[model samples]
Every structure is written in structure tokens, then in C-alpha cells.
Target: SGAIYVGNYRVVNRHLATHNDWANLVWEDSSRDLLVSSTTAQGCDTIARCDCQTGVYYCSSRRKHYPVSFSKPSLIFVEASEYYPARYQSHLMLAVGHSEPGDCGGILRCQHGVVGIVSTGGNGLVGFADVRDLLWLDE
Candidate 1:
């Protein structure tokens, strides 16, 4: 198991047997390190370091059909959410206050590089899984 398998694998992101508001499952195109910017003309602003816990960093992200959001990223923060759903508070880096719903999977990019992935948010705010918290091949 991985370091995050605190109790059991099934409940890693659960509260007993039910799914939690948020979870850290893997995707077919996911990576613990390195992120691809949603661009090519200028190329992704690759990130070499991810220090999301100790400091706040400014980042940029966009939803499928929404405008690109500019914001300050924080590992310890809170804000509103879209469609409710338990609070959007797990392994997420709050966008402080700069996005809406449907932006949950948007890739956060900074001048230096990628910061994280959108997890939840709404009403001028958003939450996303920090790339810093990624645990690869440990589970």
C-alpha cells in the first residue's frame, strides 16, 4: 500500500464505505510530477519545483468553456463550491477566489509551471489537487 493508505485502500477517500466529497484516485493520463499546460503555440510553462504548502503562488487555469482564471494558489485555504458535494476539501489547493464550476479538472499553470489540478469550486473560487501532493507508484 501507499503512505496514504492510512486505514484501507477502499476508504482512502471515504468516510467508512461511502465515497467522500473528494478523493485522490488516478487517471489514465496522470502523473505525480510534471504537468502539461493547455497550450502549444507557446508551450507549457513547465514547473521545476512545487512548494505549495509553505507559500502561496499565483497561477492560471481555464475550464472547458470558461475563460482562463488568474489566481493565488494556497494549500491551506477554503472557499465556496459548485453543486455542493461535501465541501471540496481534500488534497486541494484553493484558488483563493477566481473561478466557477466546470473548472474542476483545469490544469493550474504559473509562470514557472503547473501548480495543480482543479478539484472543485464555484462563485469566484475553486479548489484543485496540488501536484505537490501527488503520490506515484506507492499505491
Candidate 2:
């Protein structure tokens, strides 16, 4: 038997840069490993992973775009032992950036207000799928 499967796959951005807001799904294994798959600003669709032990996310180096984004939506495991898709009774905020080219930031406004200035331009994203995946948080 051949059946078709359907799911949500939004192709919004291509050049995935850092400090840029993202909304997508994050997959994980029993070892607390996190992985995100999506498109970049330069039309590069890729999958990214993060190290549970170091809270560090990895991706591929964008040849043209710097500082790629690794955020996989608002889903996250709480309590350090809890599992993904777990319900939370509160709210949270996420932000990432560096002084590099892709380092950007901004604030969100309300009631149709504009958000803060958004910055883009960095090493893009480097995935652990290759040797270019490692990135320092401070370096």
C-alpha cells in the first residue's frame, strides 16, 4: 500500500543569519541532542544540530552570508530532564548574536508597533555535519 504523508514545511527565509528570529521544528534524540532543518537566506536549505552538553548549536558556513540562525522555534525541554513538546506554564524569550558581521539585535513592539532594529551579517551558520560546525560563544 502506498499512502501519502502531509506536514507543515514553510519556506520563508534562505540566508539564515544569527540574531535573526526563527520559527521552526526541532528534533531530538533520547540523548538530548537537538536538530533543526530549514532554509537559509541564500536559498540554502539545511539541517542544523546542537550539543546538549554545551548548549552550543552548529551549522554550515555560509559562503556568502555570515552568522546563520540556529533557533528552532519556542519548543524546548525544561527541567533539564524533561522531554521535548512538554507543556510550560510560563513564557520565555530567546536571542543570539555576536559582534561579527551577522551579529544583529532588536526589540519587539506591541499593538502594531515596530520591533527593534534587526541586525544581520556574521559567519552565517556552521553545522556539525562537517568540520566547519564548531563555533565559540565568546570567541
Candidate 3:
């Protein structure tokens, strides 16, 4: 017989008020920066109106809806087709879009704003819509 374990994934966050028995699971270390910004200002500002009066670009104080706390043990997963670097590296941010509520589905994103590029499951996109409508690696 086989016993079960949450070992396969890390239990990141739980809302006691929501009344759920299980916590949200994070599958990978790269997901530490996988924040869910507001679908409204998908490209910028989150739910916050940064440039209130001026309407110019500015940062906001508004928080994300599902701000999963990223404090868990993690591991690295490499592709068989790709070559591993001899040196180590760190990733700063990641983003993902949701096709449904309460978790699941949609695209994954990692961006380089200066270069104006994104890597989605290895493919890249150029515009805001393509980049904005996205999700991040949860594992």
C-alpha cells in the first residue's frame, strides 16, 4: 500500500476565512515572483490608480488579489534538450494569467521590459495584450 504526502508540492497559503481544508500549492521555486495583478490594468498599476490627478504613469499601493506568500523549499528542474550552465543564476520575477477562478489554466510569463520581450513556455511575445494576459509558473 502507498501513503499520501504533500511532499510533491509546497503548501504556500491558506485563507481560514474562505473555509478551505487545503492550502494553495506552489510547484516551483521560480514561482516566488508569480504575482496575480489586476485584470483591469493588466499591463500596469494593478488595482491602484497610480497617477491619480495627472494621469501620468506611476506606481500604486494597491495589492494583488491572490498574493501568495513565497516562502517554501524549492528545487530546480531542467529540460533534457537544454544545456545547464556551469554557473548559478537567479530570476527576479514571473507572471501568469488565470482561465478560471480559485486556480488553474492560462499562459505563463517571464519578461524583460527593457528589451521588450517575454518567454512563454520558450516562445516570445512583443505587445502588451499578449504579455498582459498571462500567468506565471506555479512550480
Alpha-carbon RMSD to native, per candidate: 11.4, 16.6, 17.1
Candidate No. with top TM-score: 1
Clashes of 2: 26
lDDT of 3 at 78: 21
Q: How accurate locally, in lDDT, is each candidate?
A: 0.36, 0.24, 0.20
Model 1, 11-72: lDDT tens digits are: 11111111231233333222211222111123223432545332333233432222244334
Give the TM-score comparing model 1 with the true structure, all chains together.
Answer: 0.39
- Give the better candidate number (1 or 3) by lDDT: 1
lDDT of 2 by residue, 1-139 (tens): 0000112222111223223223443231222222233333333222223321113222122222222333322233333222224333111223353323232222122222211112222343221111112122102
TM-scores across all candidates? Answer: 0.39, 0.16, 0.16
Comparing 1 with 3 on TM-score, the higher-scoring candidate is: 1
Which ten residues in a row are the worst by lDDT in model 2?
A: 1-10
Alpha-carbon shift of residue 78 in model 3 (angstroms): 4.8
Inter-residue clash pairs, candidate 3:
27-139, 28-139, 95-135, 95-136, 96-134, 96-135, 96-136, 97-134, 97-135
Which stretches of model 2 miss by more than 4 angstroms?
A: 1-22, 42-139
